[PDB]
Each structure stands twice: as structure tokens, then as C-alpha cells.
Amino acid sequence: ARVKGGTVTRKRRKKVLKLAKGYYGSKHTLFKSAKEQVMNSYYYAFRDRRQKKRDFRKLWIARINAAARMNGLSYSKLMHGLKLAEIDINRKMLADLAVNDAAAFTALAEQAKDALSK
Amino acid sequence: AVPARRTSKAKKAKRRTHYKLTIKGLNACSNCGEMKKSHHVCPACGHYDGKDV
Amino acid sequence: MYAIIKTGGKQVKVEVGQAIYVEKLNVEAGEKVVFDEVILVGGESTKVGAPTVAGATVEGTVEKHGKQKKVVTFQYKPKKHSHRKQGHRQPYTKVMIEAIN
Amino acid sequence: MRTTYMAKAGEVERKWYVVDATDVPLGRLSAVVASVLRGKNKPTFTPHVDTGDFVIVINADKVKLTGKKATDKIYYRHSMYPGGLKSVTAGELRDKNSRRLIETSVKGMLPKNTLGRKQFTKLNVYGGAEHPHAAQQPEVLDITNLI
Amino acid sequence: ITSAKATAKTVRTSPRKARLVIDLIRGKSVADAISILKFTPNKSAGIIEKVLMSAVANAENNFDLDVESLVVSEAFVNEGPTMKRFRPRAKGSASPINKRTSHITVVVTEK
Amino acid sequence: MKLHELKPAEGSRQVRNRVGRGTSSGNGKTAGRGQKGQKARSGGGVRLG
RNA sequence: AUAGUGAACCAGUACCGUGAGGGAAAGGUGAAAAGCACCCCGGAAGGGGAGUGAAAUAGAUCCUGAAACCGUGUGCCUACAACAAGUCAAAGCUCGUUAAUGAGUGAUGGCGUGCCUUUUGUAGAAUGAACCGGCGAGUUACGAUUGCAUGCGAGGUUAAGU
RNA sequence: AUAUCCGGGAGUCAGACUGCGAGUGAUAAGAUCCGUAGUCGAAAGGGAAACAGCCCAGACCACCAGCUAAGGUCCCAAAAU
RNA sequence: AGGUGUAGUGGUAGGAGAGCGUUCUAAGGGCGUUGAAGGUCGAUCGUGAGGACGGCUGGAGCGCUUAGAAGUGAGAAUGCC
Ligand SMILES: [K+]
Ligand SMILES: [K+]
Ligand SMILES: [K+]
Ligand SMILES: [K+]
Ligand SMILES: [K+]
Ligand SMILES: [K+]
Ligand SMILES: [K+]
Ligand SMILES: [K+]
Ligand SMILES: [K+]
Ligand SMILES: [K+]
Ligand SMILES: [Mg+2]
Ligand SMILES: [Mg+2]
Ligand SMILES: [Mg+2]
Ligand SMILES: [Mg+2]
Ligand SMILES: [Mg+2]
Ligand SMILES: [Mg+2]
Ligand SMILES: [Mg+2]
Ligand SMILES: [Mg+2]
Ligand SMILES: [Mg+2]
Ligand SMILES: [Mg+2]
Ligand SMILES: [Mg+2]
Ligand SMILES: [Mg+2]
Ligand SMILES: [Mg+2]
Ligand SMILES: [Mg+2]
Ligand SMILES: [Mg+2]
Ligand SMILES: [Mg+2]
Ligand SMILES: [Mg+2]
Ligand SMILES: [Mg+2]
Ligand SMILES: [Mg+2]
Ligand SMILES: [Mg+2]
Ligand SMILES: [Mg+2]
Ligand SMILES: [Mg+2]
Ligand SMILES: [Mg+2]
Ligand SMILES: [Mg+2]
Ligand SMILES: [Mg+2]
Ligand SMILES: [Mg+2]
Ligand SMILES: [Mg+2]
Ligand SMILES: [Mg+2]
Ligand SMILES: [Mg+2]
Ligand SMILES: [Zn+2]
């Protein structure tokens, strides 16, 4: 028999337009522009789920570096000293101690400095 | 010379910022009280400067 | 008082009465869970593990198993008439911390 | 757990520091000053928020220029008119506009965006030993071991 | 019970130019609006004024509202249907002409 | 058997392959013909032998 | 009803062409007109009431009424900023859901040159698309051949026709 | 842990650069033509400021976890002023 | 039926496999003026095509299961209207 276009076409395009809500001007309005930008958004979103892991480790290291220097030590020497002392605390936890519990961070720094001397 | 790109809704709206009317110089007629253009004869009562003209 | 525990290939700060979300634990909902890899105990004083605090444990109860909101992986190459779409919902376990020993 | 700390505008207190430029190479002074302005010295550093301190630089006239930089380091600027390239030597800047010399050096070392331009305003440079900012109660920043 | 409306549909005027006049009266008291429209020379003023006066007549005659407190609470111009015409141009070709129409609504409220 | 529960023997019937119905089918766009040349053309191709 | 005849409708008509000839568009109120008496603003058009009706935001351009496009209201943001415009991180503000480690907006920060075609290589200063909607491209018949499947098996099978 | 062989189905017959070995050229060319290896093509990621073909390395996915490669560690900008 | 272990899972042309959705047919089993399809909105589900469930709109038809047949899927043709 004859199968006319029906409603499938509209349904499919409406899904893309919903993904494009909040985009500027025609990019949330017109299907072709919206689909092109949703594709680019997907490309960015996948790439950025990898990049966010890089960015946060970059943030923690910088914060640990600032706290390390306040304890008479560079970031690189502190991580060497913690490794020598068998401390497995990760950079997310160290950065959190650097900001929220400075006394605990100082206790870790002292253990690292002790391990470096030995 | 022809438009290279169609003008967006936002850009068209911005251009029309200054495309508007103004209604300046209306004040009450001293004879009848209806609003009138200053320095013009009142179209309602036909007076001006306190006199029928 | 708080502690840092090693769970799900990661480290989570923990306080009694707080709920954490971790990689799926193979323990039923409502059952007791014990973490035996504690690397730091904090609070008034601080205890540092080398790498684990000696004999410290963190006890909790699995409130619920669930799935995180769906994340889509859509791979395409411009001009190569080629795309791939994949959905994903990462399972998690929500654990209420009840005792830091 | 998404529990990493993030600083907010207004919660972090910004301190005031005085840095002495006397006999300090221009770039090494600027590098340490740039880090203070950005907050890189504090554990609360948050890239999308301004958390750095204020810096007063005194004795900018006595900043050090190694080698032949006094006569051979040239600062070009273009007016954007044809043939509008203007030049001045670092040595001439140090003698006449030492604030510009220090400000230009630090400007290059800050991010080129809204936040970096905002952070640059926290820099105050003076040729000589005295500044008008006693009301802020600035404290000396010793940079001998930082350069 | 508190407002009255009037609409003039398919009015042979440009929606864009009608909106220039409509913008002058939005949020104004009926007495101020009438004065503004009377001294506006633009064509849509006369049309809008009749719609406004029709809305005021609706407010008093149909709903027994106090005319003297009426204000223009809403006013807008919507596009009506476009009459399609053609203008013969040079070198044998024709160019389309849009003869546009307007839907003009004025809402007036007791206060 | 029952008319509401018909089942063919396994492997007796297969689904036809429709070309030019999107890229993910593997026969989208060029419909398996590749790029240009005589064999890409409608009715294209040389006689047998 | 862009299908199906070119033509569901006063179509081989309108319209184009000197002529042969080419050749359209255009269906739907409602169960029933019961197609809005009367009143009000207006010269009228058109509205507002009052009525008819189960419903008139079913009022004749009349079922449903998408999108482009145009406008009104406003929760959040925006006048030192160079931005394929998203994405990741994120305060603040405004909201409360298919109740979900919620929704909208978003200062600020990182990263980031559309889609397609065609190319050794294209963000490409190569091609194509103004936008939205609909329509629009491997089919069928007879034969060849291979895989799979079923029946029968040194056998298998009928064609025309009745 | 593939090889052949038999059969169904193709696509391909414009290649590019880089290293190495030659010719042509002026031991010019992002030149041309072979040989040989790689990458691109048809490969995203990191480095080379940007930069298909170079260096490191092959993305089924989730993580606000760890270790490294090339390359790096004064500020932009992660790490030894 | 599942479990364990190891390994593997970039990709154009192109080959293979397995599915989603559309209209119609048959049988079965159902839903509809106590509101079908369609439209619209929503913070919903699945590994994907896609599938539900609510509110509003709408006013008569339409799902589901198994099998069958197809004018069966559009964003590009300086495509046609
Ligand atoms: K007067
Ligand atoms: K083929
Ligand atoms: K209706
Ligand atoms: K708006
Ligand atoms: K951004
Ligand atoms: K050209
Ligand atoms: K070679
Ligand atoms: K390869
Ligand atoms: K619905
Ligand atoms: K088109
Ligand atoms: Mg279609
Ligand atoms: Mg003529
Ligand atoms: Mg078939
Ligand atoms: Mg393919
Ligand atoms: Mg295509
Ligand atoms: Mg082609
Ligand atoms: Mg070719
Ligand atoms: Mg070919
Ligand atoms: Mg027809
Ligand atoms: Mg229709
Ligand atoms: Mg026709
Ligand atoms: Mg309705
Ligand atoms: Mg209608
Ligand atoms: Mg400025
Ligand atoms: Mg501003
Ligand atoms: Mg070329
Ligand atoms: Mg282009
Ligand atoms: Mg251009
Ligand atoms: Mg064009
Ligand atoms: Mg060459
Ligand atoms: Mg090719
Ligand atoms: Mg690459
Ligand atoms: Mg490319
Ligand atoms: Mg650094
Ligand atoms: Mg050194
Ligand atoms: Mg792989
Ligand atoms: Mg149907
Ligand atoms: Mg079709
Ligand atoms: Mg189209
Ligand atoms: Zn007067």
C-alpha cells in the first residue's frame, strides 16, 4: 500500500529541537541549525567528560602547591615525600585538607618532610 | 551589492531601537481643558491665547 | 570527626550521619557495609595511614542502589557520513555512614 | 562526590602587600607579583573567581634591567594609523614612567580576559619608597627567596 | 467583570507601522490615550482610536465599568492575512507586492 | 497451527536489504556502489564478458 | 486531495500562445442552521454583549489546526566586550518535578573554525542549502546463479488446459 | 596463530607527506618518478603557539581516583625560580 | 537458564549480522463521547533506532500479540509545490 510521511518525521525533529532548548536564536528554532548544533554539543560533551578530569586534577595540584609552600615545601617535593612515607592520599583529598582542615594538611606535610630527610 | 547574510531577529530588533514615534508638546487647553498641541489652536474649542479664533 | 576511605577506585571523605554515593557495591539494600581501607582519620586530632590507618574501620548501611542520569556518547566524524550513538547509566550505591572507628 | 571547594566572590578576604622592586630584575619581580594578584599563593585558588591579593610595588625606578635591556629592550605600540608604530626603550621607561614599565610587564603575565584585567587593577606601582595606601595597612612581601 | 476588549480584524494597515502608534498608548489612561491618538498624524492612529473607543464603549455599556478610571492594560497588533499583488517591473518580469492587514486589540481595565 | 500464532521454520525467510536509507545501515548515500565511475551510474556497467 | 485521472470543486475550464499547442489552483461549520433576533461602539469593516448549540478559541478565511514567521506579558541575564555561539566548571537569583544525587537563568573560568558534497588534503577565500512544511531516488516482471529453508529423493516436478 | 583451497558479495585502479636509498631537475621545488618504512587517507587524544602526513599514542562506556609517553616545570599555564 | 576466566570492542569505500519505526492484511486478544487518532507540554524509560505515563487540546476511531505484504524512514539533488 501507500505509506505517507505521517507523523514520524515531525516526532524525530521535535526530539532534536528539545535538545536545543536554550540555544541562541535559530539554533533552538530551526531543525537543521538545531541538529547541527546538537551534533557539535555531543562532540564537545564527550570530549569534555575527559577534559573535566584533567581540569580538576589541575585545580587540586595548584591548591596543594599553595598549601605546600605555606608549609615550607614545594608541591613536587611534598608528593615525593608522601610517596616515601607510604601515604596514599590522593590529590582531591589533599586539596580538600589544604582548604578545609589546614592542621591535618600540616601533619601530612611534616610526615613528608620527615620522610625526605630519611 | 546584496546582503551576504540574512539579518537575525536580534540584529533586526536592535536596528529598530530608534524606529519609533514620539508624542511631544501636549498640554491642557486653557479655555476648555482638553489636551492640545502647544502653540496650536485647540481643535476642540477653537480657542487660542484665551480667545476664540 | 571524619575519615577518608578507599572505595570504588577512589577516595571519599566520610562523617557519621552523612550519605555517600559510591561505585556499585555487591551488598543488598539495607544491609551493613564495612570499609576496612581507611587512610586518614581526622577531627580533633589527625591519624595518617601508611597507607592505611592501623585497624580503623568505617561502618555504614546501604540505603539504596540506583543509576546515575543517562550520559550519551555520540561519536561522529564530519564529512565521513558516519556516526555512532550510545547511552549509559552508571550504577551507584548510596551508603549511610553510621560509625567511624 | 563533587565536593571540591569553590571560592565565592566576597567571601575571601584580600590582603595588601608591599613589594620592593629595588635591584630586582623586572621579569622576576613581575612573575611573583602576578602570582599574588591571581591568588596562586593561597589554597583557595579558584580559576573563575578573583581570590588574589593587592600588591603595592614601591621603588619601581630602581627595578633592575640585566644586560643591555636598558637601551636595547624596545616597547612598540601601534596607533592603528599607517606608519603609526611608536617605540620606546625600557631604560627610558624606567627613568620617566616606571609605573608603566612595571604595569606592562605584569599585564603580559596575567590572563587576557575579564578576570585578568580585573586582577590587574589590584596592582599599584610607585617610583620611590612611599605610597598613599597606609589606610589599607599593607604588609611587606619579602620576595628575595621567591625570585 | 473588570476589563473590556475590542478588536478590529483584517484592517488594511501595516502591522509594523500600527505598532509604532500602539506602543504610545500601552499602559496609559484612556483619557491620555485618546489625546495621544488624536494628535498622532500617522494613519493607524485613527484606526486604533476607534478600537480603543469601541473597547471603552464595551466597558460602560456591557459591563457597567467606571469609564473615568479605565486604563489601557493590554494593546497589540497581530498580522492579518496578506493580499497578494504584483507590480510589473522592467524587462518583462513582475515583482510581488504584499498588501498586509492587521488585527488590532485594545484591552481596558477598571484601574 | 493457529492463525494468530504462525511461525516459519528457522532460516526459511529473510529480511530484504534496502539501500539508500541512511548511513548507519551501511548502504546509505552511495547504496554500496562506491564513488563515481561507470558502475555507479543507473543502468551502468559493461556487458557480460 | 502535493495522493488518486490533468480535472473529487461548473477542467481541458481559468490562464498563456498568432496558431498548432501548453495547461493550473481550488474538498471538510454543525446532528440539525438552529448561519448569532435585540442592544452597544463604528460611515462601514469589525468587534463587545445577548442569544442558538453538547461545543462558536465549531461564526461561514468555519473539523483538527504542526512549523517557519509576527507579536504581547515577564522569571533570570545583558551597556570594557571580539562571541560557528556550544561544551565542561561555576556563584547568584527565580522556581518546585513522571521526586529524580530536581528545573529555569546565568556573572565568571577552561576548551572549541558549522552541516553536506568532493578531495592527496576543505573552517574553508571549492560545492550545495533563505527558512519551515509536504513531496522526492535499487522497483517489478521474466530468466541465470549462490546461500538459507521445506517436501520428496535415484529420483524430483508438472506446463498449457479442464 | 594463522595459512592455503572452494564458493557468495564487494569496493579500489587521482593518493599525500615524512624518514631512508636512487633517477629526472641546478644532488632547486610543498617538483617529478621508483624502491623501502611509517603516518594521513579511513585516527579522535597529548606535544610541535596555530599546523591531515612530524613526535608520543590507537577513543566500547562511567569516575571531582592513580601511574606514565612525547614534551615539559619563572608568569600566561599543570609541574624544580 | 546463567556463572567464571582470558582476550577483544577508532574507522571511509565496502561485506556480514541483528534490530527500531511507518502503512496495510490475517488471526487472536483488547481500548474508545467515563473521549480514539492527531496536536501540545512535562523534571520519564531503553545500549541505539526509539517506547511509555500524565496534564491540556481534540472530537472518532485506534492499539497490542503473532505472522504476511509493502508507494516503509529525507537535510542537502542551483530538487518540485
Ligand atoms: K486655547
Ligand atoms: K556493493
Ligand atoms: K471545534
Ligand atoms: K520572551
Ligand atoms: K564558555
Ligand atoms: K568558485
Ligand atoms: K617515500
Ligand atoms: K593503519
Ligand atoms: K499527551
Ligand atoms: K531543498
Ligand atoms: Mg516526507
Ligand atoms: Mg513590456
Ligand atoms: Mg520479502
Ligand atoms: Mg560503510
Ligand atoms: Mg547524506
Ligand atoms: Mg556522489
Ligand atoms: Mg574517482
Ligand atoms: Mg567504482
Ligand atoms: Mg490532484
Ligand atoms: Mg489535508
Ligand atoms: Mg493536478
Ligand atoms: Mg479549540
Ligand atoms: Mg479551525
Ligand atoms: Mg579596559
Ligand atoms: Mg559590565
Ligand atoms: Mg585539488
Ligand atoms: Mg561553506
Ligand atoms: Mg568566509
Ligand atoms: Mg547558494
Ligand atoms: Mg609532490
Ligand atoms: Mg578518498
Ligand atoms: Mg590526530
Ligand atoms: Mg579532515
Ligand atoms: Mg603553575
Ligand atoms: Mg633557578
Ligand atoms: Mg580501541
Ligand atoms: Mg492511522
Ligand atoms: Mg518513500
Ligand atoms: Mg525543504
Ligand atoms: Zn480648547
Side-chain angles (χ1 to χ4, degrees):
Chain A
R2 181 169 181 266
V3 187
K4 75 206 306 302
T7 70
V8 299
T9 295
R10 179 193 294 109
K11 275 173 60 181
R12 177 178 46 80
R13 293 179 188 150
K14 287 210 70 167
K15 294 234 293 162
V16 171
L17 289 173
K18 181 155 181 57
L19 295 177
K21 279 187 180 307
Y23 294 179
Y24 174 88
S26 299
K27 300 196 166 198
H28 73 258
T29 314
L30 315 181
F31 166 71
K32 296 176 187 174
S33 300
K35 180 185 170 182
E36 287 150 18
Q37 192 63 64
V38 167
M39 282 166 56
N40 280 271
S41 283
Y42 278 136
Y43 166 85
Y44 288 143
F46 176 83
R47 165 259 260 170
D48 279 354
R49 285 192 294 278
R50 275 120 281 269
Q51 282 190 340
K52 71 201 281 202
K53 295 157 178 58
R54 309 172 189 175
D55 286 1
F56 273 98
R57 185 172 161 107
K58 177 175 292 219
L59 178 54
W60 302 325
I61 288 164
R63 293 182 171 171
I64 292 164
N65 209 341
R69 316 238 167 200
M70 272 147 52
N71 292 269
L73 221 61
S74 56
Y75 167 94
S76 60
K77 283 292 105 197
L78 174 66
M79 304 305 295
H80 181 45
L82 288 177
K83 188 184 139 207
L84 287 156
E86 302 289 12
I87 311 311
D88 265 334
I89 187 172
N90 70 25
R91 290 152 188 75
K92 183 187 180 180
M93 296 293 95
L94 274 165
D96 194 79
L97 298 173
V99 175
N100 293 119
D101 186 351
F105 188 95
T106 289
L108 287 161
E110 297 298 350
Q111 277 184 252
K113 295 191 288 189
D114 159 90
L116 287 170
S117 85
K118 292 198 182 64
Chain B
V2 311
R5 307 285 315 128
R6 70 186 292 163
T7 302
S8 85
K9 294 185 190 198
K11 179 64 179 181
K12 172 177 63 180
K14 289 177 175 202
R15 182 180 66 240
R16 290 163 181 180
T17 296
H18 304 286
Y19 178 53
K20 59 183 182 181
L21 300 176
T22 59
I23 183 61
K24 302 187 167 192
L26 292 189
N27 52 23
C29 172
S30 178
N31 178 75
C32 74
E34 287 286 315
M35 225 58 51
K36 67 172 201 79
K37 283 176 58 172
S38 55
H39 303 92
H40 284 66
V41 181
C42 186
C45 70
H47 283 48
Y48 188 77
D49 200 7
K51 289 177 286 293
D52 183 60
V53 302
Chain C
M1 181 174 61
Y2 71 87
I4 297 168
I5 59 174
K6 206 182 300 187
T7 318
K10 290 171 280 294
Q11 299 173 359
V12 188
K13 172 178 171 183
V14 149
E15 299 178 354
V16 176
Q18 295 286 112
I20 59 178
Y21 300 80
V22 302
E23 300 293 345
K24 176 173 72 62
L25 297 174
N26 197 10
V27 284
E28 302 290 356
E31 298 302 313
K32 309 304 289 293
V33 51
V34 298
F35 311 100
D36 62 0
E37 302 189 11
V38 188
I39 56 176
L40 182 140
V41 177
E44 175 278 352
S45 173
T46 299
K47 322 282 289 308
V48 171
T52 62
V53 178
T57 180
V58 170
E59 303 176 310
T61 301
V62 179
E63 290 188 2
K64 163 183 68 171
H65 297 282
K67 292 184 176 184
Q68 309 193 57
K69 294 284 254 296
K70 174 175 278 181
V71 295
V72 177
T73 286
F74 176 90
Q75 295 269 20
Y76 88 96
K77 251 63 166 198
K79 307 185 171 55
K80 305 312 179 186
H81 35 272
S82 168
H83 55 247
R84 216 208 336 117
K85 188 179 184 185
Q86 173 185 341
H88 185 92
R89 302 197 63 185
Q90 186 65 16
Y92 70 85
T93 300
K94 188 186 179 180
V95 181
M96 168 53 69
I97 307 297
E98 294 161 8
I100 294 166
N101 297 337
Chain D
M1 295 302 305
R2 297 184 79 90
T3 63
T4 296
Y5 169 88
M6 295 294 178
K8 316 177 188 292
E11 62 156 32
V12 181
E13 165 55 15
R14 282 116 76 99
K15 298 179 58 45
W16 281 76
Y17 287 98
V18 195
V19 178
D20 200 352
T22 314
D23 280 326
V24 180
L26 173 65
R28 297 172 188 275
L29 171 74
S30 302
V32 302
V33 170
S35 54
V36 170
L37 298 170
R38 264 172 59 81
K40 284 290 231 60
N41 51 322
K42 284 136 64 181
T44 56
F45 165 73
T46 306
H48 70 278
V49 171
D50 183 14
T51 53
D53 302 323
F54 295 80
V55 184
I56 298 163
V57 174
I58 61 176
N59 291 316
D61 291 329
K62 310 198 194 316
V63 72
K64 185 180 186 185
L65 295 180
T66 56
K68 291 169 175 169
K69 285 170 199 179
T71 59
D72 304 18
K73 180 173 171 63
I74 305 172
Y75 284 97
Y76 300 90
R77 85 197 94 93
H78 210 279
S79 70
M80 309 188 68
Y81 290 75
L85 186 69
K86 315 281 161 45
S87 76
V88 66
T89 66
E92 175 161 36
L93 273 181
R94 183 174 55 178
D95 286 9
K96 286 154 59 58
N97 208 332
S98 67
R99 165 178 290 182
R100 172 161 301 167
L101 180 59
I102 303 292
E103 285 180 0
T104 288
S105 188
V106 171
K107 235 173 188 166
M109 298 186 196
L110 292 176
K112 289 75 178 53
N113 53 27
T114 302
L115 184 52
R117 290 191 293 274
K118 194 74 230 305
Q119 278 155 343
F120 170 81
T121 62
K122 303 189 297 187
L123 178 66
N124 297 92
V125 183
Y126 299 96
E130 57 90 356
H131 57 80
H133 304 302
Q136 279 59 56
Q137 303 156 222
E139 78 201 59
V140 173
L141 181 56
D142 191 0
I143 64 164
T144 56
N145 296 292
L146 302 187
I147 62 172
Chain E
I1 180 172
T2 57
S3 74
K5 66 166 74 78
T7 302
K9 285 187 68 167
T10 312
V11 172
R12 180 72 185 88
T13 184
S14 163
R16 294 184 57 210
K17 300 179 187 156
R19 283 166 192 148
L20 302 177
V21 179
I22 267 285
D23 280 68
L24 295 175
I25 63 174
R26 192 174 294 110
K28 300 246 160 41
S29 65
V30 167
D32 295 351
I34 288 169
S35 296
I36 294 173
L37 296 176
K38 278 177 176 172
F39 295 103
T40 294
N42 307 61
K43 170 182 170 197
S44 66
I47 305 172
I48 289 160
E49 181 175 346
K50 284 200 165 185
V51 179
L52 169 64
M53 293 298 290
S54 183
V56 177
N58 293 345
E60 184 187 26
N61 182 87
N62 295 329
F63 319 114
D64 300 306
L65 298 182
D66 184 7
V67 168
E68 289 87 3
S69 69
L70 299 181
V71 304
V72 183
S73 45
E74 183 178 18
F76 48 90
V77 184
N78 283 323
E79 299 172 356
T82 308
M83 313 192 295
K84 308 302 198 186
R85 303 287 179 258
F86 292 98
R87 182 103 234 139
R89 303 301 290 271
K91 293 172 184 166
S93 53
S95 168
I97 299 292
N98 300 288
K99 286 196 165 179
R100 299 174 180 275
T101 54
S102 301
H103 298 326
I104 303 169
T105 304
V106 175
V107 187
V108 83
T109 52
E110 242 293 17
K111 286 186 181 184
Chain F
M1 228 168 182
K2 290 301 186 170
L3 294 177
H4 51 279
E5 293 154 329
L6 302 174
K7 304 293 235 178
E10 306 306 334
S12 58
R13 313 178 73 88
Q14 296 82 33
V15 173
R16 185 223 290 263
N17 175 237
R18 292 173 295 119
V19 301
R21 292 301 183 275
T23 55
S24 70
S25 64
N27 275 194
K29 185 184 172 188
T30 57
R33 289 180 179 268
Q35 185 67 5
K36 293 184 182 178
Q38 188 172 12
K39 299 166 70 154
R41 311 295 170 191
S42 167
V46 291
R47 60 170 186 268
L48 294 178

